[PDB]
Structure formats: C-alpha cells, structure tokens
Design a binder for this molecule. Structure first.
Ligand SMILES: CC(=O)Nc1ccc(C(=O)O)cc1
Length: 115
C-alpha cells in the first residue's frame, strides 16, 4: 500500500529473455503453422470463430516496438496462439499436434527462464 513496497523482482533482462524464447520458438520445426497470421480471406471460418488472432510474427513486431508492458502480457499472447490453435484444429491433425508440442516447449522455457 502507500509507502509500503514489496521487494521488486529484477525485471531488467526480461525483454532480452523473452526475445530469446521467441527466437527458439520461431526456429522450432513445428512452428510453421504459427509463423504468420492465418489468412482470413482464404481460411473458411477463421475470422468469425477466432476473436483475437495471434501469431509469432505479430508477437515479434510487438516485442520489437515496446508494445508489451511486462513479461506477463508477452506470455498471454504466446498462449493465445496455442489456445486459438486448439479452438480451431482437431487434436489429431498435424496443426493440432504442432500446437500441443509448441505449448509444451514454450511452458518449459518459461519456467526455466523465470522460475
Ligand atoms: C494456426 C492455424 O490454425 N492455421 C490453419 C491454417 C490453415 C488451415 C486449413 O486450411 O485447414 C487450418 C488451420
């Protein structure tokens, strides 16, 4: 509360660390469904069903331009990519499996890096 501060986690390296994690995700061989925005004009159903599209190149643009206030807002966008993937793809499809694989991959990097 007022004039009573909790000790503050050192966040000075967060930007560099999130950038490293994003790089590792960009270079994963199962990252191909997630590198670019889904084409809303060429994929039936996507625009109406998926209220907030997100993809790695969009996350990268936002990271590079000061659009994440903190590391938690970054993790929310990454998770949104995989949440969207589950909403739209069968668990047993190449893309659906790619999504599950990348989420597992991300969450371990997240834990190892910040916890
Ligand atoms: C991220 C994501 O779901 N992408 C896509 C892209 C294309 C299709 C399709 O054409 O079936 C399905 C899903």
């Amino acid at each position: 509360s007022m004039s009573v501060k909790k000790p503050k986690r050192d966040d000075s390296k967060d930007l560099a660390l999130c950038s490293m994690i994003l790089t590792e995700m960009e270079t994963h061989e199962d990252a191909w469904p997630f590198l670019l925005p889904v084409n809303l004009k060429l994929v039936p159903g996507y625009k109406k069903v998926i209220k907030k599209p997100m993809d790695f190149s969009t996350i990268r643009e936002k990271l590079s331009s000061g659009q994440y206030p903190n590391l938690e807002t970054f993790a929310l966008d990454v998770r949104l990519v995989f949440d969207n993937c589950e909403t739209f793809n069968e668990d047993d499809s190449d893309i659906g499996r790619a999504g599950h694989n990348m989420r597992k991959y991300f969450e371990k990097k997240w834990t190892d890096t910040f916890k």
